[PDB]
Structure formats: C-alpha cells, structure tokens
Design a protein around this ligand. Structure first.
Ligand SMILES: [Cl-]
Ligand SMILES: [Cl-]
Ligand SMILES: [Cl-]
Ligand SMILES: [Cl-]
Ligand SMILES: [Cl-]
Ligand SMILES: [Cl-]
Ligand SMILES: [Cl-]
Ligand SMILES: [Cl-]
Length: 281
C-alpha cells in the first residue's frame, strides 16, 4: 500500500533502530508488583520480563494465583490474546490450568524447545500418545491424540481433561518450528502461512477464550505474531485501510505487556509481514 513506500523509506534512511528506540521510550510503564513478590521468583523465566498487575492472568485454584502471562485485549480489532513465557518445569500445570480456566481453544508456540543448543521452554505437552501427562498440582491430564507434522509447522490435537470434573476439551497446538536461530526470516511467507493456518482453525474466534501465544519470554516472537494479526485485522476492517499505523498498534499492545518486539529487526520483520499479508488479503 502506502505502507510499502514508508518501508522502503525507512530502509533507505537506515532508521529502524531509531524508530524501535522511540517505541521503547514511549512505551507504557505499569506496576508488576505481584510478579516481583519473593514467592513468585521461580515462576518467572526471565527476571527482566514480567506481566503488569492490571493485565496479568490470575489462576483460580486455592494456591498462589500467579502465572507469567498477560491478557492483550485489542478493542478496535476485536481480538484478545494471552501472551505468556515458555512454561518452566514447575509451571506446566499452571500453564494448562490457565488454558482450562480461560477457555482457550488454541496454543501458539513460536520456538523450538531448544535453539542454538539452549532450552527455551519445558516439554509441556506429550510427544507420544501412550505417555500422557498428568499435572498433579492442578489436577489435569493431557493426551496427544494426533499430530500433523508439516515442513514449517506442526499442528497437534491434544485432549485436556479436568480430572476433577472429568470434562475433556480438544486443544489445538500450533507449533511454528522454522523461525531462524539468528535474526528474523528474510521473507515473511512461512510466518504468514502459519498465521493463516491458525486463523483457518477457528482458534482465534471470539466464541473461544483467547488464544495462548508463547515463545521463550512471551514478548518478541509472540509480539510479532499478535502485532501482525491485529494490524491485518485493522487493515481489512477499517474504512481507510491505509490509516493503520503499525507503531501505534504496537504501543497500544504494550499497554498490556512490556517489551513486545525485542529488536529493530523484529520490528522490520513485522512491517514486512503486514505489508505482504495485506496484499494476500
Ligand atoms: Cl512473597
Ligand atoms: Cl485494536
Ligand atoms: Cl520443539
Ligand atoms: Cl508442508
Ligand atoms: Cl481471522
Ligand atoms: Cl523466542
Ligand atoms: Cl492505527
Ligand atoms: Cl523493550
């Protein structure tokens, strides 16, 4: 659109770093008192990445209500997302408790469990049908029903059972497995194909709870996913689709969780994905 002209402008002038730093400087600052309580030290993967008190997801069971997760409610775009860190070995039961209580239908994972030889996330779902997972703290059972492994992502059908009530729910697990180890993708094509697969699944529909999106810290790749999805919604929905300002959308999102988009390359990649995605739609 006109967006692609502004994009070439930013590239010519080499000012992605400058735009990104303005975003960091204008971003909202809200308290994260609960996240920083001493008893929550082992529920945070990165001490530098915390949910704001006002938007944090609260667990319902009689125990510590804390999980490192934030509700991002985009009013104009009419979509909500839960952004969360990759679960830790002691928070997988909390993670699936949140999926249950928030009535999510899909989980979007944007990292490999290990990248460049380092763990980014616990193995929080079963890899084999016959070896289900029981989370004794939150009283939940999780079974792999089937999985469709494709070249750039995997979709799994998971069965989540509340062992307290014996109610069961089918959760769709969308695992984007091909984000580059370093930097961002030269092209947003496979990321966009992945987004549209998630959309096509129904998981983002308002009849469900918000999709749960995560990477390692729940702000960088996760922020890219939600930013692009929301901008593409706004471009398809607004009377004047050229009025969608990606930087403004990102600042709005950052009222709900700190640090969304962690690098100027991720910002540039987001612009690129929205540009290419808008052509498609
Ligand atoms: Cl405490
Ligand atoms: Cl919005
Ligand atoms: Cl993995
Ligand atoms: Cl494929
Ligand atoms: Cl959609
Ligand atoms: Cl990550
Ligand atoms: Cl806007
Ligand atoms: Cl930041």
């Amino acid at each position: 659109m006109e967006m692609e002209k502004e994009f070439e402008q930013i590239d010519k002038s080499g000012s992605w770093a400058a735009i990104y730093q303005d975003i960091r400087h204008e971003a909202s600052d809200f308290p994260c008192r609960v996240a920083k309580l001493p008893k929550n030290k082992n529920r945070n993967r990165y001490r530098d990445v915390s949910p704001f008190d006002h938007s944090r997801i609260k667990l319902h069971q009689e125990d510590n209500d804390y999980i490192n997760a934030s509700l991002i409610k985009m009013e104009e775009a009419q979509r909500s997302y839960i952004l969360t860190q990759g679960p830790l070995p002691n928070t997988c039961g909390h993670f699936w408790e949140m999926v249950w209580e928030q009535k999510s239908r899909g989980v979007v994972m944007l990292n490999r469990v290990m990248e460049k030889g380092s763990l980014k996330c616990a193995q929080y779902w079963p890899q084999k049908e016959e070896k289900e997972m029981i989370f004794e703290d939150t009283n939940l059972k999780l079974t792999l029903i089937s999985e469709d492994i494709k070249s750039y992502y995997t979709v799994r059908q998971l069965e989540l059972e509340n062992l307290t009530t014996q109610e069961t729910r089918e959760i769709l697990h969308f695992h984007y497995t091909t984000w580059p180890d370093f930097g961002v993708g030269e092209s947003p094509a496979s990321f966009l194909n992945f987004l549209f697969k998630v959309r096509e699944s129904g998981s983002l529909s308002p009849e469900h709870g918000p999709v749960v999106v995560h990477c390692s810290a729940g702000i960088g790749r996760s922020g890219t996913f939600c930013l692009a999805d929301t901008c593409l919604l706004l471009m398809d929905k607004r009377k004047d689709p050229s009025s969608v300002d990606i930087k403004k959308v990102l600042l709005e999102m950052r009222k709900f969780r700190m640090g969304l988009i962690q690098t100027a390359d991720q910002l540039r990649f987001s612009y690129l994905a929205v540009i290419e995605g808008a052509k498609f739609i």
